[PDB]
Amino acid sequence: PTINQLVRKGREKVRKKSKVPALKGAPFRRGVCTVVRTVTPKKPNSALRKVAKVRLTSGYEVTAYIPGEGHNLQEHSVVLIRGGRVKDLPGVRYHIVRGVYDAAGVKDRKKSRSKYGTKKPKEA
Amino acid sequence: MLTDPIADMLTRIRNATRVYKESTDVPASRFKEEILRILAREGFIKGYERVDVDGKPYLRVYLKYGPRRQGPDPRPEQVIHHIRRISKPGRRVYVGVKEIPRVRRGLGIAILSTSKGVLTDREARKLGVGGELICEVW
RNA sequence: CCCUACAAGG
RNA sequence: GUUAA
RNA sequence: UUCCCGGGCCUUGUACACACCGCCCGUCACGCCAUGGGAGCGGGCUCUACCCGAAGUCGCCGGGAGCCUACGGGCAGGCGCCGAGGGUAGGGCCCGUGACUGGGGCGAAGUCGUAACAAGGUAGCUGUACCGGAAGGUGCGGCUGGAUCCUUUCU
RNA sequence: GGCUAAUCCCCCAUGUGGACCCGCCCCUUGGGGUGUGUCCAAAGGGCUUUGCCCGCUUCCGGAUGGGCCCGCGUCCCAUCAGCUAGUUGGUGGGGUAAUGGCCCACCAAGGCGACGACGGGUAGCCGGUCUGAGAGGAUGGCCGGCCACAGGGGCACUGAGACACGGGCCCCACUCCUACGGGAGGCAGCAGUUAGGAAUCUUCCGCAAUGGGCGCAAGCCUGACGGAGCGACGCCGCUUGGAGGAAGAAGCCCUUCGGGGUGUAAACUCCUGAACCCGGGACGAAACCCCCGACGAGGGGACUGACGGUACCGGGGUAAUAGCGCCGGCCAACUCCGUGCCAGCAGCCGCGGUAAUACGGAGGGCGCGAGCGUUACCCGGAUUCACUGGGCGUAAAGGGCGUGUAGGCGGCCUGGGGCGUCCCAUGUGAAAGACCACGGCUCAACCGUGGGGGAGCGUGGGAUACGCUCAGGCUAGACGGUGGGAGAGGGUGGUGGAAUUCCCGGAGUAGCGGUGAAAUGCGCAGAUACCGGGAGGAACGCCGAUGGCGAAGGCAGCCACCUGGUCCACCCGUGACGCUGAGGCGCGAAAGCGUGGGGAGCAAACCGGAUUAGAUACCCGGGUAGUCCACGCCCUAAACGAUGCGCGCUAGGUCUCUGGGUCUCCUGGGGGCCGAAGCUAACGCGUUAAGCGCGCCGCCUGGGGAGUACGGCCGCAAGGC
Ligand SMILES: NC[C@@H]1O[C@H](O[C@H]2[C@@H](O)[C@H](O[C@@H]3[C@@H](O)[C@H](N)C[C@H](N)[C@H]3O[C@H]3O[C@H](CO)[C@@H](O)[C@H](O)[C@H]3N)O[C@@H]2CO)[C@H](N)[C@@H](O)[C@@H]1O
Ligand SMILES: [K+]
Ligand SMILES: [K+]
Ligand SMILES: [K+]
Ligand SMILES: [K+]
Ligand SMILES: [K+]
Ligand SMILES: [K+]
Ligand SMILES: [K+]
Ligand SMILES: [K+]
Ligand SMILES: [K+]
Ligand SMILES: [K+]
Ligand SMILES: [K+]
Ligand SMILES: [K+]
Ligand SMILES: [K+]
Ligand SMILES: [K+]
Ligand SMILES: [K+]
Ligand SMILES: [K+]
Ligand SMILES: [K+]
Ligand SMILES: [K+]
Ligand SMILES: [K+]
Ligand SMILES: [K+]
Ligand SMILES: [K+]
Ligand SMILES: [K+]
Ligand SMILES: [K+]
Ligand SMILES: [Mg+2]
Ligand SMILES: [Mg+2]
Ligand SMILES: [Mg+2]
Ligand SMILES: [Mg+2]
Ligand SMILES: [Mg+2]
Ligand SMILES: [Mg+2]
Ligand SMILES: [Mg+2]
Ligand SMILES: [Mg+2]
Ligand SMILES: [Mg+2]
Ligand SMILES: [Mg+2]
Ligand SMILES: [Mg+2]
Ligand SMILES: [Mg+2]
Ligand SMILES: [Mg+2]
Ligand SMILES: [Mg+2]
Ligand SMILES: [Mg+2]
Ligand SMILES: [Mg+2]
Ligand SMILES: [Mg+2]
Ligand SMILES: [Mg+2]
Ligand SMILES: [Mg+2]
Ligand SMILES: [Mg+2]
Ligand SMILES: [Mg+2]
Ligand SMILES: [Mg+2]
Ligand SMILES: [Mg+2]
Ligand SMILES: [Mg+2]
Ligand SMILES: [Mg+2]
Ligand SMILES: [Mg+2]
Ligand SMILES: [Mg+2]
Ligand SMILES: [Mg+2]
Ligand SMILES: [Mg+2]
Ligand SMILES: [Mg+2]
Ligand SMILES: [Mg+2]
Ligand SMILES: [Mg+2]
Ligand SMILES: [Mg+2]
Ligand SMILES: [Mg+2]
Ligand SMILES: [Mg+2]
Ligand SMILES: [Mg+2]
Ligand SMILES: [Mg+2]
Ligand SMILES: [Mg+2]
Ligand SMILES: [Mg+2]
Ligand SMILES: [Mg+2]
Ligand SMILES: [Mg+2]
Ligand SMILES: [Mg+2]
Ligand SMILES: [Mg+2]
Ligand SMILES: [Mg+2]
Ligand SMILES: [Mg+2]
Ligand SMILES: [Mg+2]
Ligand SMILES: [Mg+2]
Ligand SMILES: [Mg+2]
Ligand SMILES: [Mg+2]
Ligand SMILES: [Mg+2]
Ligand SMILES: [Mg+2]
Ligand SMILES: [Mg+2]
Ligand SMILES: [Mg+2]
Ligand SMILES: [Mg+2]
Ligand SMILES: [Mg+2]
Ligand SMILES: [Mg+2]
Ligand SMILES: [Mg+2]
Ligand SMILES: [Mg+2]
Ligand SMILES: [Mg+2]
Ligand SMILES: [Mg+2]
Ligand SMILES: [Mg+2]
Ligand SMILES: [Mg+2]
Ligand SMILES: [Mg+2]
Ligand SMILES: [Mg+2]
Ligand SMILES: [Mg+2]
Ligand SMILES: [Mg+2]
Ligand SMILES: [Mg+2]
Ligand SMILES: [Mg+2]
Ligand SMILES: [Mg+2]
Ligand SMILES: [Mg+2]
Ligand SMILES: [Mg+2]
Ligand SMILES: [Mg+2]
Ligand SMILES: [Mg+2]
Ligand SMILES: [Mg+2]
Ligand SMILES: [Mg+2]
Ligand SMILES: [Mg+2]
Ligand SMILES: [Mg+2]
Ligand SMILES: [Mg+2]
Ligand SMILES: [Mg+2]
Ligand SMILES: [Mg+2]
Ligand SMILES: [Mg+2]
Ligand SMILES: [Mg+2]
Ligand SMILES: [Mg+2]
Ligand SMILES: [Mg+2]
Ligand SMILES: [Mg+2]
Ligand SMILES: [Mg+2]
Ligand SMILES: [Mg+2]
Ligand SMILES: [Mg+2]
Ligand SMILES: [Mg+2]
Ligand SMILES: [Mg+2]
Ligand SMILES: [Mg+2]
Ligand SMILES: [Mg+2]
Ligand SMILES: [Mg+2]
Ligand SMILES: [Mg+2]
Ligand SMILES: [Mg+2]
Ligand SMILES: [Mg+2]
Ligand SMILES: [Mg+2]
Ligand SMILES: [Mg+2]
Ligand SMILES: [Mg+2]
Ligand SMILES: [Mg+2]
Ligand SMILES: [Mg+2]
Ligand SMILES: [Mg+2]
Ligand SMILES: [Mg+2]
Ligand SMILES: [Mg+2]
Ligand SMILES: [Mg+2]
Ligand SMILES: [Mg+2]
Ligand SMILES: [Mg+2]
Ligand SMILES: [Mg+2]
Ligand SMILES: [Mg+2]
Ligand SMILES: [Mg+2]
Ligand SMILES: [Mg+2]
Ligand SMILES: [Mg+2]
Ligand SMILES: [Mg+2]
Ligand SMILES: [Mg+2]
Ligand SMILES: [Mg+2]
Ligand SMILES: [Mg+2]
Ligand SMILES: [Mg+2]
Ligand SMILES: [Mg+2]
Ligand SMILES: [Mg+2]
Ligand SMILES: [Mg+2]
Ligand SMILES: [Mg+2]
Ligand SMILES: [Mg+2]
Ligand SMILES: [Mg+2]
Ligand SMILES: [Mg+2]
Ligand SMILES: [Mg+2]
């Protein structure tokens, strides 16, 4: 565009949309489990992915993933959401943090333990 | 009617040199002549001269080029490899003496029109003055 | 479990 | 009928 | 050597490339989710008109109605304008809900046909118009982003 | 109701002086001087008591602090475009320290806005901070500056200062106390409670130091502050050991069962000594005060430490925490088993379907280490809003075309001014921070001192090339003159022949029509085919082109009239009168809409015949709107060269339309093809540019959702922007 046009209209700073409306852009959000479902992945994949419908303190009710093999969540389990979507589950944009609230840490987990919330087992 | 008689000249020169013409004419004007003075002095062109084309005043600009060359495409290197307008109608470019650019570490030049007359970037720096940054050459 | 890892069929 | 090589 | 089957060479179109037994469109069915319209129903803001109007400053009175007085004046008190807010009527605006209602996104293997890509089997696309389970079909005009010199879907 | 003191209040006097009216002078907005008139002062207390200290009154000035005013700068939405009555200005008042519609009386009719008013949304602003090569982007916590607020709203009183967080009054909400009349209260001070939240600490010590208020002083107050406590929240420093030690224990993992790995790692030997334990033990603190001196200078003297028995010293002295992420590519690091599109991983690409370096465990490995990961957010990479530093023929992007308003841009020469621009000097640019140097804590973090910075803005002076402005000149752009030219350019009227349909007459008879084949249909009320006549509507064969004209849409028989554009020649006139163009306005294929008319042929819909698995189609027979005209709407498009307009520049060849010329050919305007240089991702473009440049407009910014929803504007509607 001409310089005159640039003087007349300038450029437009374009902003980005959040991939995570956990309101306050808080790093995490608390909520209660409304439903504990199972969901099928998209095309390339097949499996019974574990998801939960959570009613947030942020006034939102979004579905969150329940990572790990374990899992002990029911229709009233209070839990902490963190954000991190699931490439396979369109609509699932948050992960439930294991080891916090009513969400038990994955038991017998021996590797990436800090994720999955699993304390260190005694070695001898 | 031209909108940038200066830009016009830099281009007539640019286009001509690109086809290895011996010389090229440009509508006459003092300011334009002054710029030509430097190109000559700086050895970018053989030189120039007033002439009258069909009754009107022009300026034959005698172009320079390197020697014929080796292999394929024996066309000679250009003396004036780059001649570019900086300040322009509706975007004039002005610089203070500490803002005069250094074209190609000195290998090239800048031509400003100062209140002390048209000067190469060195001539300007020397006389300690800035002005309108007309163009750049190398 | 028969097909080919499945779907669907027996 | 789907997904692969 | 026109035709059926397999094949070789040149060329052309292609949205095909585990390569036409390719690709692929829309309706509909099942599941998840966001969302538009929306009578009525409540919450708030705002503008206009009129009305009521605390405190307080200011202005007038301050009288044979009160207090002080060195008679000049002062205080109390009274009245008024402005005035936080409030009321009634009307107009605009926003938020929540919302019967009923429109379409949309997304989710390996459900249903119907086959619209498009090769002249895709009636060249396609297009603005508009009517019409039809659906893709679409047809009219009129336009564009090339069109191949060349009985009939038949799928995968 | 009564009594009473003062540095409380008042009257009189003195008037250095000051205030006010009027005059004059100087100066220039209300600044300074001067004259007359008028008006205005005061507080006492202490004693080392005949003279000092604290203090009071008036005035001028200083210093510090502040009020008000002005230039410039300060986020998003134009789906916010018109806003305004104290509104804009005046005169005269009120108010204040003071200007001012700050407030009022009256008069005038003004003020503001596309350089974005008004409305809506969001937000305290800076020094700085983070990031970035820079330009820039993001940000404003701690510290410093300014502002604003003190439960919400309004208000004034006191005072130098407030319209006052721990002052006052009223209204509102809320809490508490009430004998129900009526009262009390405001932690956005320190700490602490509770609620909300992913989340943020002690109801600590001290007033020793620095700083503040009151006091002559002693000294009193100070949750300001100086410290301690809690939290890996961050940064920096430190530890968990050092040297020796086997061709190499065991265990565990691989294996080709030979052996390879963990690995000098361990064990074990020796050495040093984090912790701890003793003893010493701070700096921060020397003033105020007191004595001498003169309550000065100067000199002596005394008191005082929260932190803390801490830091730091010296002695003794134990071998004494390691975790977390990761290992398919990006990206450093591979094997075994389990599992079998399951369970699960996943930042993006992707991985798992029975031998998975990608899942889960293990061995091994890589990375970092009192941390390591994750999530969230900011800058970067992203020249991915491109000023530096991008684009639009086919990738997203040229507006359907023109006219032209504001605006942006502007040929050659001379002169004035000196706004832009450039130069010098100078003022400003607080501290902290950043940078460099040196220095203080054993280092560092942290901190001290010093050095250097600049943009921006103010002031004075200077320059004049370019841009600007004024003045004059010019003729190369532009426009005009005269003379010629070609054209389906437009509008109105008239008019010609071919064909179809229909009607009439003649003649003639059994079918015609239609298809792949058929049938519907039409025909003995005589069709088809043929001849003659008539009516009507619509469109113009050959010429005709790869042609011409127009801004696009688009325009085609012939004639007349009215009318637009354009090209060449002659160099005749004007003398930069130019280019572009937001908005506006006009034009704008087809279909469609309204009123009226027309209606031959064609033909959405529709009625039928076929075809087909079906056939809401393609083929066949009919057929309404419509197609045509007038007038008014609609405003779209593959409105396309998918290429905005103007100008200058950069080989040619060939065909062609139209004009001029000394007419092999030269010169101008237009239409094509191939190609120089160059450009392009390529295809291609290439003097009719997509090349080289300048000016202006329009537009793009991943795909779907969606040209949808909402709002506005327009339309009768369909619907358009
Ligand atoms: N998301 C697709 C959108 O909706 C339409 O597509 C939707 C349907 O038409 C389509 O349906 C297909 C069907 O066409 C096809 N013949 C069979 C197939 N099983 C269906 O599939 C659908 O349903 C199954 C469950 O039954 C899901 O697992 C699957 O993900 C889903 N796409 O699947 C889509 C639903 O996701 C439009 N045609 C498409 O252009 C548009 O983008
Ligand atoms: K034959
Ligand atoms: K006097
Ligand atoms: K003073
Ligand atoms: K001041
Ligand atoms: K006034
Ligand atoms: K800022
Ligand atoms: K800033
Ligand atoms: K002394
Ligand atoms: K020691
Ligand atoms: K040890
Ligand atoms: K197995
Ligand atoms: K593995
Ligand atoms: K980023
Ligand atoms: K377009
Ligand atoms: K338009
Ligand atoms: K001059
Ligand atoms: K003419
Ligand atoms: K018959
Ligand atoms: K043509
Ligand atoms: K009609
Ligand atoms: K090329
Ligand atoms: K609308
Ligand atoms: K309307
Ligand atoms: Mg920019
Ligand atoms: Mg898979
Ligand atoms: Mg993530
Ligand atoms: Mg140039
Ligand atoms: Mg150049
Ligand atoms: Mg099937
Ligand atoms: Mg699969
Ligand atoms: Mg064959
Ligand atoms: Mg052969
Ligand atoms: Mg072929
Ligand atoms: Mg090919
Ligand atoms: Mg395939
Ligand atoms: Mg009233
Ligand atoms: Mg009152
Ligand atoms: Mg009174
Ligand atoms: Mg009111
Ligand atoms: Mg709603
Ligand atoms: Mg419905
Ligand atoms: Mg699913
Ligand atoms: Mg079709
Ligand atoms: Mg088809
Ligand atoms: Mg087929
Ligand atoms: Mg057909
Ligand atoms: Mg077809
Ligand atoms: Mg159509
Ligand atoms: Mg039809
Ligand atoms: Mg057509
Ligand atoms: Mg085509
Ligand atoms: Mg069929
Ligand atoms: Mg099918
Ligand atoms: Mg087939
Ligand atoms: Mg009394
Ligand atoms: Mg007395
Ligand atoms: Mg007194
Ligand atoms: Mg006197
Ligand atoms: Mg006197
Ligand atoms: Mg005066
Ligand atoms: Mg005077
Ligand atoms: Mg006097
Ligand atoms: Mg007196
Ligand atoms: Mg006044
Ligand atoms: Mg006054
Ligand atoms: Mg006012
Ligand atoms: Mg505003
Ligand atoms: Mg705020
Ligand atoms: Mg950058
Ligand atoms: Mg601060
Ligand atoms: Mg307030
Ligand atoms: Mg509060
Ligand atoms: Mg209050
Ligand atoms: Mg208040
Ligand atoms: Mg107050
Ligand atoms: Mg308080
Ligand atoms: Mg809580
Ligand atoms: Mg603290
Ligand atoms: Mg103190
Ligand atoms: Mg003190
Ligand atoms: Mg106290
Ligand atoms: Mg402190
Ligand atoms: Mg913390
Ligand atoms: Mg060792
Ligand atoms: Mg000790
Ligand atoms: Mg000392
Ligand atoms: Mg000390
Ligand atoms: Mg003391
Ligand atoms: Mg003495
Ligand atoms: Mg002393
Ligand atoms: Mg020892
Ligand atoms: Mg690697
Ligand atoms: Mg398993
Ligand atoms: Mg992992
Ligand atoms: Mg991996
Ligand atoms: Mg550390
Ligand atoms: Mg950038
Ligand atoms: Mg971007
Ligand atoms: Mg740019
Ligand atoms: Mg780009
Ligand atoms: Mg396309
Ligand atoms: Mg495109
Ligand atoms: Mg165009
Ligand atoms: Mg203009
Ligand atoms: Mg000029
Ligand atoms: Mg101008
Ligand atoms: Mg100047
Ligand atoms: Mg400075
Ligand atoms: Mg300066
Ligand atoms: Mg500084
Ligand atoms: Mg040091
Ligand atoms: Mg410093
Ligand atoms: Mg100056
Ligand atoms: Mg001048
Ligand atoms: Mg002139
Ligand atoms: Mg002349
Ligand atoms: Mg003429
Ligand atoms: Mg014509
Ligand atoms: Mg007859
Ligand atoms: Mg007869
Ligand atoms: Mg019959
Ligand atoms: Mg008969
Ligand atoms: Mg006849
Ligand atoms: Mg008729
Ligand atoms: Mg033309
Ligand atoms: Mg056309
Ligand atoms: Mg002439
Ligand atoms: Mg124009
Ligand atoms: Mg039209
Ligand atoms: Mg029409
Ligand atoms: Mg009509
Ligand atoms: Mg009609
Ligand atoms: Mg017909
Ligand atoms: Mg049938
Ligand atoms: Mg038909
Ligand atoms: Mg076209
Ligand atoms: Mg344009
Ligand atoms: Mg040519
Ligand atoms: Mg030509
Ligand atoms: Mg020609
Ligand atoms: Mg080339
Ligand atoms: Mg070419
Ligand atoms: Mg050009
Ligand atoms: Mg191009
Ligand atoms: Mg657009
Ligand atoms: Mg779209
Ligand atoms: Mg539309
Ligand atoms: Mg439409």
Domains in chain A, CATH or no CATH each: 1-124 (2.40.50.140)
* Same structural domain, B103 and B54: no
* Same structural domain, B63 and B88: no
Count of the separate structural domains present in chain B: 2
Distance (Å, whole) CA B134 – CA B95: 10
CA-nearest residue to A4 within chain B is B90
State the resolution, in angstroms: 2.8
Contact assessment for residue B53 and residue B86, using Cβ atoms and an 8 Å cutoff = no
Distance CA B98 to C1' F450 in A = 29
What residues contact residue B70 under an 8 Å CB cut-off, 6+ apart?
A: none
* Same structural domain, B73 and B87: no
* Same structural domain, B54 and B19: yes
Using a CB–CB cutoff of 8 Å, tell me whether A5 touches chain B: no
Q: Nearest CA of chain B to the CA of A12: how many Å?
A: 21
Provide the domain limits for residue B86. 81-138
Contact assessment for residue B138 and residue B106, using Cβ atoms and an 8 Å cutoff = no
CATH of residue B18's domain is 3.30.1370.30
CA-nearest residue to A5 within chain B is B90
Burial label for A99, CB within 10 Å (0-12, 13-18, 19+), is middle
* Same structural domain, B64 and B11: yes
Tokens 């969540």 -> residue:
A73
Distance (Å, whole) CA A92 – CA B59: 74
- Single residue among B80, B108, B125 that ends a domain in this structure: B80
* Same structural domain, B74 and B87: no
State which approach was used to obtain the coordinates.
X-ray
Which amino acid type is present at position B78?
Answer: Q
* Same structural domain, B47 and B67: yes
- Single residue among B53, B80, B107 that ends a domain in this structure: B80
Nearest to B124 by CA among B104, B105, B99, B107: B99
Distance (Å, whole) CA A27 – CA A72: 24
d(CA B96, ligand 28 centre) in Å:
23
Distance CA B55 to C1' F573 in A = 20
Q: Which two tokens stand for residue A2?
A: 């001409």
Residues with CB under 7 A from strand E: A 35, 40, 42-43, 46, 53, 61, 63, 90-91
Residues pairing with A79 in the sheet:
A31
CATH of residue B104's domain is 3.30.1490.10
Q: Which two tokens stand for residue B134?
A: 């007309």
- Single residue among B62, B80, B98 that ends a domain in this structure: B80
Scanning A47-106 for CB atoms below 8 A from B yields: none
* Same structural domain, B63 and B45: yes
